[PDB]
RNA sequence: ACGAGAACACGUAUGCCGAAGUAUAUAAA
């Protein structure tokens, strides 16, 4: 699933990225991710709150909405396996895996931000 | 030899940007990932404004010379006569009450207000984005005061009263003139933690 | 830094995008007023009469009988008293669909800043032949209107005024005749001065007259309005069409080709009360 | 240095659209989710107008280097000059009276206003939706004045009252040209919160 | 929960959505729900004021009006149990449940928007 | 009865300063 983190370099075509993705269009997603990263990080146990499960549900909702608004975001989310990993993280409900997803997503964001028009 | 502890909470009125990291993020603890107010910020702003209160000539400004009793309170120990500092300002940390509050009501710990700049002769705008600590946040602070000279307690607490009151009418962090970072102090407390000194006649508003 | 006074010569509409369906009105065929209904007060009446389930089902699967597909009949079937039927009217004007204007927070109609510079821009572009008028758009500022009390709101039917008159199936609410509406004007480009703006509008109107307004003659509604409005003198007056509902036009061959392309016939209003037709849009503007 | 406070209220005459956060939303807080007027907006607008009132050559415009007295009033500290700002503007917050009024009259806080463009020689519309702060709402502000020197306070408040008048007949926010953004000022109050200066002869219209 | 998720994929037939549902057809409902959202957020206590109860009553009236206006909206509301959910919300008179309903309905709308012609 | 034994890498100062989320965008039918 790290090939999903370095697919970003395989997606530098001719020049636009992800067919015109800009990090600027990722802002709402980044904000929500940071919010719940902080909230999870302060948490003690590995078992997540049921309210936190509902929060993750709200994450998937927002991801789908953003994929609906913009096509480049849609390609980014679909081909990098974002949706299955979100579902899987919701399935295990363990803190460390949620942090693992957070590190993957942040690595994606930063590396994509390296290349922009 | 006694030490007096000063405790309370800082309530953010308008968004605050300390932001020592430099996008343009705020200082954050690396164990909780929450914003902090470095104690150097409090000490420096109190230093500066209570200095500008009293005499501060251009010669004093150039050589960084200040008033004898502000120097006494905050210490100089650079040249001339060495005065060891007397008020220890600690950092402030994001309180658990407000943590429960914002977790329950699902409110972000940081807003990213977007700002613009209209340059002249071109009127072309170039945007920027700034992180700012959400209002209603509460930070818990501690001060420690050392009694090196018994007879001077009243004057020193008078001056720190001046400092608190003047700070409440000023800013912390950046963008102070742009609206950012006004604070108020609330639920103060004075108590003798070490020694044999009474601290009942003391007050800080 | 000037105040602008607007004298509505004719019915003026600014479409809000809200199209009322077969609900929230009573259409009195026999006294010719339609009664908008406060949703809150009406439904809390329904609950003080515990008929809300009846009202809901009434709405839900309409009888498909056109005489039985309104709101007045729904209220009558429950024998609701006319005074209470007067108790539950939010506001009224003298209808399958009805088009509402923009409203402010307190349901108070106001004239937008988009419409007023819409007409003013159009006037400037035509007079100066688009002399960088897009740049001067930023240097001419129009404040929104003050509110418009419902003392000057009434419903009108869209009339297709050609050599034989035809009605459009729906209506549009409009401002009544002769209403006085003010806004405030600010100028950041002194070149297009107050008198310059007024003369630009006037020249636009005169060109409009000698191109199109002369052609609709020999139509009964035409010469009635054309003469009643006093347009031969109006060539001296500062008259302009605001908002929507004015003709699409607001040489002949190029106009024909363009109009074919666009559409790929005059819009006005006819009253029953006085049998007098007004074309939608024109109003008088004077500065101070 | 003493500090003189200015408090008051912005009345929303016609719509107001900041929209820094963006269908095309406006700037909103996150502790109450009720809109605000960022202080940066107010400060920038007043600075632009008051600069324009004084001299402004293409060179002044070239590098945001402005007339010396406005510079004194708002601070530059760029051209090797010691100038920290003397006038602090905070944010404006949806007031309590407004909230109660709109609750007990059942009126929303935000209008969603639909706009179109009509293409030339095309007559085809492309619609837009713009969301603006509802009219008649009031926001409250607080300003802080610092007296770095005694003998420019009257002149500086003369400048500020001129600026407030200019704002009272201008627009704050987005697209006042297209209609929204006129404001008015009510309930100006002048106190010297910290210091020994008198606030009786000083006035702002 | 996210029954919205699998329901939205259950309503993809042959292509029509809920027999032709479109996002333009729910604008008024979205506006009303948003206003009730902000008003309830402004509230402090969990007990719902009788005025907010009347707001919920008028919201129910508006669902019924729109469902009578169009058939596809009727099928959407009928299968998504909007009416039973609103009835239960009115019965409970708790603010948190109303916010949970808000999140559910937002997810519904987001899915409906992401799957469109 | 240990090339020992006394010995605070201490003291002074903050993320500052100027920046408007702007410009067009007839609510057509």
CSV table of C-alpha atoms in Angstrom, one decimal, chain B residues 42-144:
chain,number,residue,atom,x,y,z
B,42,UNK,CA,4.3,36.6,28.5
B,43,UNK,CA,7.6,37.8,30.0
B,44,UNK,CA,8.6,39.7,27.0
B,45,UNK,CA,5.3,41.6,26.5
B,46,UNK,CA,5.1,42.4,30.2
B,47,UNK,CA,8.7,43.6,30.1
B,48,UNK,CA,8.2,45.8,27.0
B,49,UNK,CA,4.9,47.4,28.0
B,50,UNK,CA,5.7,48.0,31.6
B,51,UNK,CA,9.0,49.4,30.5
B,52,UNK,CA,7.4,51.8,28.1
B,53,UNK,CA,5.2,52.8,31.0
B,54,UNK,CA,8.0,54.4,32.9
B,55,UNK,CA,11.0,56.4,31.6
B,56,UNK,CA,12.5,54.9,28.4
B,57,UNK,CA,14.8,57.5,26.6
B,58,UNK,CA,16.4,57.0,23.2
B,59,UNK,CA,19.8,56.4,25.0
B,60,UNK,CA,18.0,53.8,27.2
B,61,UNK,CA,16.5,52.3,24.1
B,62,UNK,CA,19.8,52.0,22.2
B,63,UNK,CA,21.7,50.5,25.2
B,64,UNK,CA,18.7,48.4,26.3
B,65,UNK,CA,18.8,50.1,29.7
B,66,UNK,CA,15.5,50.1,31.6
B,67,UNK,CA,13.9,51.2,34.9
B,68,UNK,CA,15.4,50.1,38.1
B,69,UNK,CA,12.4,48.4,39.5
B,70,UNK,CA,11.1,46.7,36.3
B,71,UNK,CA,14.7,45.4,36.1
B,72,UNK,CA,14.4,44.3,39.7
B,73,UNK,CA,11.2,42.4,38.9
B,74,UNK,CA,12.5,40.7,35.8
B,75,UNK,CA,16.3,40.7,36.3
B,76,UNK,CA,19.1,42.0,34.1
B,77,UNK,CA,22.3,40.4,35.2
B,78,UNK,CA,24.2,41.7,32.2
B,79,UNK,CA,26.6,44.4,33.4
B,80,UNK,CA,26.9,47.2,36.1
B,81,UNK,CA,25.1,45.8,39.2
B,82,UNK,CA,23.8,42.2,38.7
B,83,UNK,CA,20.2,41.7,39.9
B,84,UNK,CA,19.0,38.1,39.8
B,85,UNK,CA,15.5,37.8,38.4
B,86,UNK,CA,12.6,37.5,40.9
B,87,UNK,CA,9.4,36.6,39.0
B,88,UNK,CA,9.5,33.3,37.1
B,89,UNK,CA,6.9,33.1,34.3
B,90,UNK,CA,6.0,29.6,33.2
B,91,UNK,CA,4.3,28.5,30.0
B,92,UNK,CA,0.6,28.2,29.6
B,93,UNK,CA,-1.1,24.9,28.5
B,94,UNK,CA,-4.4,24.1,26.9
B,95,UNK,CA,-6.8,23.4,29.8
B,96,UNK,CA,-8.8,20.2,30.2
B,97,UNK,CA,-12.1,22.0,30.8
B,98,UNK,CA,-12.0,23.6,27.4
B,99,UNK,CA,-10.8,20.3,25.9
B,100,UNK,CA,-13.9,18.6,27.1
B,101,UNK,CA,-16.0,21.5,25.9
B,102,UNK,CA,-14.7,21.6,22.4
B,103,UNK,CA,-14.6,17.8,22.1
B,104,UNK,CA,-18.2,17.5,23.2
B,105,UNK,CA,-19.5,20.3,21.0
B,106,UNK,CA,-17.3,19.3,18.0
B,107,UNK,CA,-15.4,22.5,17.5
B,108,UNK,CA,-12.0,22.7,15.8
B,109,UNK,CA,-9.0,23.7,17.9
B,110,UNK,CA,-7.7,25.9,15.1
B,111,UNK,CA,-9.2,28.0,12.4
B,112,UNK,CA,-7.4,29.0,9.2
B,113,UNK,CA,-8.7,32.4,8.3
B,114,UNK,CA,-7.7,33.5,4.8
B,115,UNK,CA,-6.5,37.0,4.2
B,116,UNK,CA,-5.7,39.1,1.2
B,117,UNK,CA,-3.5,42.0,0.1
B,118,UNK,CA,-4.5,44.7,-2.3
B,119,UNK,CA,-1.3,46.2,-3.6
B,120,UNK,CA,-1.4,49.7,-5.2
B,121,UNK,CA,-1.0,50.8,-8.8
B,122,UNK,CA,-1.9,47.2,-9.7
B,123,UNK,CA,-4.9,46.3,-7.4
B,124,UNK,CA,-3.8,42.7,-7.9
B,125,UNK,CA,-4.5,40.5,-4.9
B,126,UNK,CA,-2.2,37.9,-3.5
B,127,UNK,CA,-3.7,35.7,-0.9
B,128,UNK,CA,-2.3,34.3,2.4
B,129,UNK,CA,-3.6,31.9,5.0
B,130,UNK,CA,-3.0,32.1,8.8
B,131,UNK,CA,-3.8,29.7,11.6
B,132,UNK,CA,-5.3,31.1,14.7
B,133,UNK,CA,-6.3,29.7,18.1
B,134,UNK,CA,-10.1,29.5,18.5
B,135,UNK,CA,-11.7,31.9,21.0
B,136,UNK,CA,-13.1,30.6,24.2
B,137,UNK,CA,-9.9,28.5,24.6
B,138,UNK,CA,-8.6,28.6,28.1
B,139,UNK,CA,-4.9,28.2,29.1
B,140,UNK,CA,-3.6,27.5,32.6
B,141,UNK,CA,-0.7,29.5,33.8
B,142,UNK,CA,1.5,29.6,36.9
B,143,UNK,CA,3.8,32.3,38.1
B,144,UNK,CA,6.3,32.0,41.0
